[PDB]
Amino acid sequence: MEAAHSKSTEECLAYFGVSETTGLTPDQVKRHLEKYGHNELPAEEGKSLWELVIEQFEDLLVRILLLAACISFVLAWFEEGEETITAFVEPFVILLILIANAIVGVWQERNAENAIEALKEYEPEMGKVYRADRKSVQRIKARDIVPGDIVEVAVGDKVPADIRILSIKSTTLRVDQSILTGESVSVIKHTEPVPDPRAVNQDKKNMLFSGTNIAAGKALGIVATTGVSTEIGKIRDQMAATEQDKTPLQQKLDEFGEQLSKVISLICVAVWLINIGHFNDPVHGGSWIRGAIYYFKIAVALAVAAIPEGLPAVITTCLALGTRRMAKKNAIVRSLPSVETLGCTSVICSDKTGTLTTNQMSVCKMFIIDKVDGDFCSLNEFSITGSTYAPEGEVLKNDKPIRSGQFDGLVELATICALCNDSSLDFNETKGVYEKVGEATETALTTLVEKMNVFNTEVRNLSKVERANACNSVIRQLMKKEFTLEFSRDRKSMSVYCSPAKSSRAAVGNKMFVKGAPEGVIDRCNYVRVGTTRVPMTGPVKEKILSVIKEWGTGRDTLRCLALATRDTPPKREEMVLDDSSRFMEYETDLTFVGVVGMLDPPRKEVMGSIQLCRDAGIRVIMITGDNKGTAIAICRRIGIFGENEEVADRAYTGREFDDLPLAEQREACRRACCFARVEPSHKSKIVEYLQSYDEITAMTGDGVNDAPALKKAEIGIAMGSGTAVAKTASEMVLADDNFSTIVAAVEEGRAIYNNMKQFIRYLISSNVGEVVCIFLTAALGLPEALIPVQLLWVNLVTDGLPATALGFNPPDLDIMDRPPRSPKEPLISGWLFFRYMAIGGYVGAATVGAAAWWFMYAEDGPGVTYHQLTHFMQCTEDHPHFEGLDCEIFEAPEPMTMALSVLVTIEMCNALNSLSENQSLMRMPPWVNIWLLGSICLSMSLHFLILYVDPLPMIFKLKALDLTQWLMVLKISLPVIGLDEILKFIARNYLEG
Ligand SMILES: Nc1ncnc2c1ncn2[C@@H]1O[C@H](COP(=O)(O)OP(=O)(O)CP(=O)(O)O)[C@@H](O)[C@H]1O
Ligand SMILES: [Ca+2]
Ligand SMILES: [Ca+2]
Ligand SMILES: [K+]
Ligand SMILES: [Mg+2]
């Protein structure tokens, strides 16, 4: 606990009784846990109230059905309806479908959150501390840190606790504290006290708050507070939903439902108007009110029928399902749209190092100069074993293990690698492995120096912990690191200003030790070191050095190379201004070349494959990297971005070549080129922007801060689980796995969610069109009513519920990942599909009117009215416009009506079977591809039998139908709806477009 940011660095150390560079003792840490608990928010708990989710009524169309059930509860309250109790059933025929879909939605959402909360909590967050039990910095669980220990944070890292800054190891320290202060741009920090105890967080310029991200620099501090006492800890419970509105496709379908509410409203008022000339009819006694209310009920019931009441849930559901399936592949979704958006991505831009490659770095080759004589230059090359970060392996020259100390060129080589380096190693005792602290490229240098052991230090009798940094520490005692010119991606190098260590001889020379991209560094060299000697840089020397770099970077190991140099005579510190990072390059001039290291960095296994799948899916993959163009092109080949022997001259570019191009040509280069190299963070962003200017959906994958701008800019930003917190922050998805395959999977899922939404709509429209075609084809062709209000509400409950929602669990189409991506501004509803909605809607409306007719006309138990309907309904009371006045009322017989209600239910459950796939046949895509659908169909048919044969029920709805031969007819008329779509799918297949 520390109340103050207003106390000085010394006072904070004194308060906790801690040595700045050693950190807490094991006993101190024991005390501090007990007194302060673990560094974590207990919270964890309660996302959405069981109730909250229940309240996914509130939606567009569900509220309509809600109101629709009110009028039924009020019309029932006034003793009637028409038949007394049949009016209290109505309200519950409407609630039921709503409650059914609500249950499925709530369930899928709960499962989703669970799955996601499982994935998020899986891998433990880590921190870096100095603690007394170890000399070099170590990694602990962030949960285990307490007030008082010395913590190290660097560019990329998330600040793990509230920290009072002790020492800034770079020339500046920039922090992204948006999450806490709203402050959109990163802010500078210092170590001077801030007097005001009153002061607001933005004035705490010497503190780092848990949960923020370091944007630039490296610092050291002491933890003031942890857990709930955290500045961000205090404020969690509170905020008016920094939570959000719905996804593009959701807003699209919402909009589509909105204008469907128009067309249905109209057709409904039209039913009420096309009739109520049947107002005064003998059915309701002829009152000038009763018939108006009845046909008003026909309207309302027809409305609840036509309205896709489950559209709002099926999407909410397919989303939560897509998340839950991503989480099962170890993808964290931070933003709902990600899966759909990736659905129609045509270009995936990808970082190389850490993303396309493992970022498990290993120096396996190096060289220094051997001889220089006229235009003859020779190199002493060396190999190094050990691929892991473990200080175990040998230096070989001509296949024999050597003692690196033998070569003075290697002594300095190792010196630079050790001093010019902000990273280190730490031995994990539990896992039993040497793990990096900081950047891989640097940690590889660390492990290299432990293998070169150039001053012959005695390391065999050390613990695995101590062995991890021992030779590096030896070097650190040789020289005092006065300060460092932090790496920057414009100069592509890093610097360190050093003086000899005991101060014994206080002017034998300060030095700067430099490492960087070979091309930039070699150009700023005027001397080449030869052993302990120095000679001018010349053309032939430079050419030698560079050709071996070309060799290593392009050969079969594809080595990531770095050059190491020293500045023999540095400027005086007083001539050096540390304020403007843009002067660092001049300070790193007049250098002496020492050597080069070549690093192994294997491509991930799953990549080559993932890329093929992209090609097939019509998705372009582009490598984007700071690294050399040689090594990047070679890797692209090894990955399949380029073939092993393609001319790549105009489809690979450096930042410099790309900048040399006119804007028009830059944009065009982005369309053909698949490899961009030696490129800065601003270029990564610009390439993504260019792609987006062809109105394409662009994804960016990465891991470092050099990728955040591009990650923010792309439609979907995907961060590696192994990468930086700042990459993760700027992302919409995170691959905790680091598994690149998942990106392709997520593409397929987003594609499939789309397709599922389609079939759901196709099913409902084409079916609910038939339901309306029916009422209108009777009232116009001049027939008796086929259905009643409650009978309309029944087909709704039983055709528009679970059999529809179930389509959302359709399996992916067979070719879903073999067509190009969809354009995002494509007509939701295709012109050809609208015709298919009608061709199906027509057969359904005609098969149901033609069914009630067959009962009257060609049916043995029916009266034999024979063709021409006998021409009217007029008959009324006893024997009228005497046209075979044989049978009186048969109209109002339940028989014709419950015939139609059964063709309607049966036939709707039939074209649901064609809604498994847009254009695939039931022959290639059987009904059992979706079981969830089949079970829902049974529940419907089953519910529909129950209503027919459980005696109290048939009264409330209206009398049954002869099992044996009536059903044979319903099933004879309904079944062909399958055969029709199947010829219609044949059309859209063996002729094609889309
Ligand atoms: N800590 C460091 N010190 C000195 N030079 C470094 C360095 N890290 C990287 N470099 C050099 O700077 C170049 C540019 O780095 P940058 O971060 O832009 O690309 P990168 O190759 O490091 C990663 P990516 O492939 O993910 O773009 C590297 O290719 C390497 O030559
Ligand atoms: Ca409906
Ligand atoms: Ca329906
Ligand atoms: K983005
Ligand atoms: Mg990277």
Q: Residue 329 belongs to a domain with what CATH number? A: 1.20.1110.10
Contact 791, 957 (CB under 8 A): yes
Residues with a catalytic annotation lie at 351
Distance of CA 887 to the CA centre of its chain: 69
Domain boundary, last residue among 745, 779, 813: 745
CA distance 724 to 623: 19
The answer on 542 and 430 residing in a single domain is: yes
Please tell me what resolution, in angstroms, this structure has.
Answer: 2.6
Q: Which residues contact 546 (CB under 8 A, 6 or more apart)?
A: 518, 519, 522
Instruction: HSE, CB side, 13 Å, CA atoms: give it for residue 377.
Output: 23
The answer on 633 and 566 residing in a single domain is: no
Ligand 5 center–CA 711 separation, angstroms: 12
Look-up of token digits 């800054």: 165
With H, G, I as helix, E, B as strand and everything else as coil, classify residue 914: coil
Nearest one of 215, 216, 226, 236 to 163, comparing CA atoms: 226
- Residue stretches of the annotated binding site for Ca(2+): 304-305, 307, 309, 768, 771, 796, 799-800, 908
The answer on 919 and 789 residing in a single domain is: yes
Counting from 1 in the atom list of ligand 1, the atom nearest the Cα of 632 is 25
Nearest one of 134, 108, 125 to 53, comparing CA atoms: 108
Provide residues with CB under 6 Å of ligand 1.
351-354, 439, 441-442, 487, 489, 492-494, 515-517, 562, 625-627, 704, 706
The answer on 179 and 251 residing in a single domain is: no
Distances (CA, A) of 382 to 372, 398, 521, 756: 18, 8, 21, 59
Beta-carbon count within 10 A of 138 CB: 23
The answer on 585 and 656 residing in a single domain is: no
Amino acid at 268: C
Nearest one of 508, 517, 498 to 563, comparing CA atoms: 517
Look-up of token digits 């309607």: 904
The answer on 172 and 67 residing in a single domain is: no
Domain boundary, last residue among 690, 711, 745: 745
Q: Please, which experimental method was used?
A: X-ray
- Residue stretches of the annotated binding site for Mg(2+): 351, 353, 703
Contact 691, 667 (CB under 8 A): no
The answer on 565 and 478 residing in a single domain is: yes
Contact 944, 902 (CB under 8 A): yes
- The ligand with the least distance to the CA atom of 769 is 3
Domain boundary, last residue among 208, 242, 276: 242
Q: What is the DSSP string of 314-376?
A: HHHHHHHHHHHHHHHTTEEESSTTHHHHHHT--EEEEEIIIIIB----EEEEEEEEEEEETTE
Q: How many residues does the chain have?
A: 994
Which range of residues forms the domain containing residue 471?
Answer: 359-602
CA distance 440 to 815: 41
The answer on 849 and 802 residing in a single domain is: yes
Pull the structure tokens for residue 636. Answer: 């692209």
Beta-carbon count within 10 A of 955 CB: 12
CA distance 333 to 707: 19
Q: Residue 700 belongs to a domain with what CATH number? A: 3.40.50.1000
The answer on 68 and 35 residing in a single domain is: no
Strands of 174-176's sheet, edge to edge? 187-188, 174-176, 213-216
Ligand 5 center–CA 726 separation, angstroms: 12
Using CA positions, which residue lies closest to atom 8 of ligand 1?
A: 441
Q: Residue 205 belongs to a domain with what CATH number? A: 2.70.150.10
Distances (CA, A) of 743 to 35, 120, 720, 733, 737: 45, 18, 11, 9, 11
Task: Give me the residues paired with residue 770 across strands.
Answer: none
Using CA positions, which residue lies closest to atom 17 of ligand 1?
A: 626
Ligand 5 center–CA 568 separation, angstroms: 32
The answer on 192 and 141 residing in a single domain is: yes
- Residue stretches of the annotated binding site: 304-305, 307, 309, 351, 353, 442, 489, 515, 560, 625-627, 678, 684, 703, 706, 768, 771, 796, 799-800, 908
Counting from 1 in the atom list of ligand 1, the atom nearest the Cα of 423 is 1
Q: Residue 365 belongs to a domain with what CATH number? A: 3.40.1110.10
Counting from 1 in the atom list of ligand 1, the atom nearest the Cα of 562 is 31
Using CA positions, which residue lies closest to atom 19 of ligand 1?
A: 626
With H, G, I as helix, E, B as strand and everything else as coil, classify residue 267: helix
N- to C-terminal Cα separation, the chain? 64
Contact 345, 747 (CB under 8 A): yes
Burial of 209 (0-12, 13-18, 19+ CB in 10 A): buried
Amino acid at 114: N
Look-up of token digits 């006893």: 878
Per-residue burial over 909-944, b = 16 or more CB atoms within 10 Å of its CB, e = otherwise: bbbbbbbbbbbbebeebeeebbebbbebbebbbebb
Ligand 1 center–CA 397 separation, angstroms: 28
Tally of domains within the chain? 4
CA distance 582 to 593: 22
Look-up of token digits 């399949």: 640
Distance of CA 42 to the CA centre of its chain: 27
- The ligand with the least distance to the CA atom of 440 is 1
Tell how strand 362-373 and strand 591-600 pair up: antiparallel
The answer on 422 and 300 residing in a single domain is: no
Ligand 1 center–CA 673 separation, angstroms: 21
Contact 828, 341 (CB under 8 A): no
Contact 532, 553 (CB under 8 A): no
Look-up of token digits 């499925």: 104
Nearest one of 345, 457, 472, 331 to 405, comparing CA atoms: 457
Counting from 1 in the atom list of ligand 1, the atom nearest the Cα of 561 is 31
- The ligand with the least distance to the CA atom of 703 is 5
Ligand 4 center–CA 733 separation, angstroms: 9
- The ligand with the least distance to the CA atom of 625 is 1
CA distance 368 to 962: 97
Mutation test of ligand 1: which of 706, 711, 718, 726 has the most ligand atoms closer than 8 Å to its C-beta? 706
Counting from 1 in the atom list of ligand 1, the atom nearest the Cα of 516 is 5
